[PDB]
């Protein structure tokens, strides 16, 4: 009845607000229905906005993601006579790099790794993906756990503009923002490791 597709890459998140969108082009383009499940092909995730883990539009939202949430989730995509079930491994880690090095990011998945081209005007991104109901407040950026304060760096909402990339620009970057969902405020901090090409 439904074609099983296995996602080869694991998605990692800190124990804080997290959202993953069921965007799998070309299958999710056009008139299709999307249903999120939590390690089941029969019982879906809750649709109650007040649930800690719930389906918000095409997204699975964790407010917040916490220890015990790691596992396999399923996005069932149904079109006009067509069914696909994506098995997605979402994994939570407990701590942030600037607080402690223990129990943090277990591996450098693609999302936590970015590159800056030496001598070029380049940019970094947050990897802060949330549905429209999660309004992101002012975004602050850090380099090696200290707020960025340099002529070549410019915060531009969810992007960090970097002028004339130098070799000293290698290091860990992070972006922090206040997330506002249903009148409640939560904090989100996302890190990245940047290497200079």
């Amino acid at each position, epitope marked *: 009845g439904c074609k099983d597709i296995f996602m080869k890459n694991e998605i990692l998140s800190a124990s804080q607000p997290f959202a993953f969108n069921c965007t799998f082009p070309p299958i999710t383009s056009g008139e299709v229905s999307v249903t999120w499940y939590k390690n089941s092909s029969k019982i879906p995730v809750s649709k109650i906005i007040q649930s800690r883990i719930h389906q918000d539009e095409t997204w699975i939202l964790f407010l917040p993601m916490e220890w015990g949430d790691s596992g396999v989730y399923q996005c069932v995509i149904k079109g006009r006579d067509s069914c696909h079930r994506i098995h997605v491994n979402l994994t939570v880690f407990e701590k942030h790099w600037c607080d402690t090095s223990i129990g943090g990011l277990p591996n450098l998945s693609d999302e936590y790794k970015q590159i800056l081209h030496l001598g070029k005007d380049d940019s970094l991104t947050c990897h802060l993906h949330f549905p429209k109901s999660c309004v992101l407040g002012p975004i602050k950026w850090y380099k090696d756990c*200290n707020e960025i304060k340099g002529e070549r760096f410019t915060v531009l909402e969810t992007r960090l503009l970097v002028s004339n990339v130098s070799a000293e620009d290698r290091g860990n970057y992070a972006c922090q923002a206040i997330l506002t969902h249903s009148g409640k405020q939560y904090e989100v901090l996302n890190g990245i*490791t940047v290497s200079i090409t």
Partner: antibody
Amino acid sequence: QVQLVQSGAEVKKPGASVKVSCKASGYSFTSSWIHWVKQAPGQGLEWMGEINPGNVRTNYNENFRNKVTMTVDTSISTAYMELSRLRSDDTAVYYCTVVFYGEPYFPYWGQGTLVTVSS
Amino acid sequence: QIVLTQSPGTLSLSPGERATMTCTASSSVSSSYFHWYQQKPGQAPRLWIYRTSRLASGVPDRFSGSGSGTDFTLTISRLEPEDAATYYCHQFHRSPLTFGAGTKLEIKR
């Protein structure tokens, strides 16, 4: 290549303090946690704590709270471990090690520093 | 504190034999946070096996790591004289960081 160079061996009388150095190279010093590990003669390894040179934040093992104090001088890429109120139980080879983001293990270590506590 | 109970404490084997050492954690450790180190006298510990089963730089294929949750194992399939060392397991999951008491490997001849 990533390298950690520690200060030389020291003898201190009981009650004194000692400061051990760990000068790093081969990577951006401010981007990684420096950890300190104790090895008393003939014994195993005991984790003492960690310091982030970027924000100077420290986390000590509860067993070493107020015995160990960790510090950094980012201008010379050096991490410092200070031990106070020295006793023969503090006699050990102390190692510094470094952890990188997304790589939660100790791939590089210093040569060690023997601190002997004696009258 | 996650306690790591390493066994045996000492192991005496001839070259070519299989060396097996186990490490038991009091609480579950994720595969990415469990490691083994090799230490020779008068030298610092060397990363030997990282993330439960990956071999660190310069580590021969005769070494392998396995395990999950609370039970982990380090195996040397065909002992060489160079393997005489102390091996320590290690967890990077919860504070404070802990190590097993060690397994000293002696080589018979």
